[PDB]
Every structure is written in C-alpha cells, then in structure tokens.
Design a protein around this nucleic acid. Sequence first.
DNA 1: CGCGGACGAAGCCATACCATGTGGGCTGTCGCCTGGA
Length: 145
Amino acid sequence: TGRPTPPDMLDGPTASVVCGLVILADWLVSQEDFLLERLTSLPADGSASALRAHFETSLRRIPSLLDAAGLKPNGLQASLAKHLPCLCTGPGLVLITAPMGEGKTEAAYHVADLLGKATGRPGRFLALPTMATADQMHTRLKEYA
DNA sequence: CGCGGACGAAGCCATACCATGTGGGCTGTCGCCTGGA
Ligand SMILES: [Fe+3]
C-alpha cells in the first residue's frame, strides 16, 4: 500500500463513514464472479513482485463492477434565488415551507443544487412518505438535470 | 335502618453435526472304648 503515515487523531463519525467505505469495498470485490473471473492468474508465490502485480491488476480494472453495478417563477423562488446566493457560504440546512402544489420543488432543487455546488457533492436523495411519488417524479424530475 | 363479606379497581409483559467404563464378608467338628500314664 506504500507504507502510509499514522494519523495523529480520529473521531467516531469519521471512523463510522470510513467503516461503511471498507465494508462497501469488501462486499464489492466479495461478489461471486469476479472471483471465478480473475481465478485464472493465481499468484505462484507471495513475493512483493507477484502481489504488486495482482494488486496492480485490480487497480487496472475495478471500475468494471462500479459502472456495471450502476454507481413564470413565483415570489419565493425569486427571493431565495435573489438573496440566497450571498448566504451560501457552506454547510447548513434550508427549511422551506410553501403552499401545496405551488411549486416548492423548483426552489427545492434550485437552492438544493446551488448549495450542493457550494459543498461539492453532486448526488442527492429525497425521502418521501409514499410510493407513487417515487415512481412519478423519478422520471418527471430526471430529464432536466 | 345498620351493616358483613366479598370483589374489583391497575401496575404489569419482553451479508460476504459427536459421549462415558463398575462392583467384594460369613461359619462351625468328633468314633468309641480299653489301657496306661
Ligand atoms: Fe472480505
């Protein structure tokens, strides 16, 4: 791995998220074939050369599984889009309370995505307490992004 | 009218097949008669 240095400190949450990372990679390469796939160029010995090679071949193509697995505006919108670009300095939360069916969605992904750029993470996630809303806005809201 | 005895009102509950070794305690026998010590 290149003999990394020791980190002077760590905290719980960091260890939790990176634990999700490690278990993710484990389950990742874990899948069956794989296994059978590369089950042809087995290492003959354990010297640094052969292990460097095998590790280097996984580095050659791991993204295979990655992509193979799939991984007139209203007043409110004008006021948030108007003044909010000054307040968007970093991580926080925006609680929006708009009338039913008025279009709170537009301001939701507008500000949500501007702030996503402010924090630097493209993907998002919406939790809805129904079932048909997922299957409807899944497409309704996908072809514009 | 004054009252005995009996019940009921709840707070409670609880994703990376296999094994056993142990012991010991109770019973009475003759050939009889003469001779010598
Ligand atoms: Fe593993």
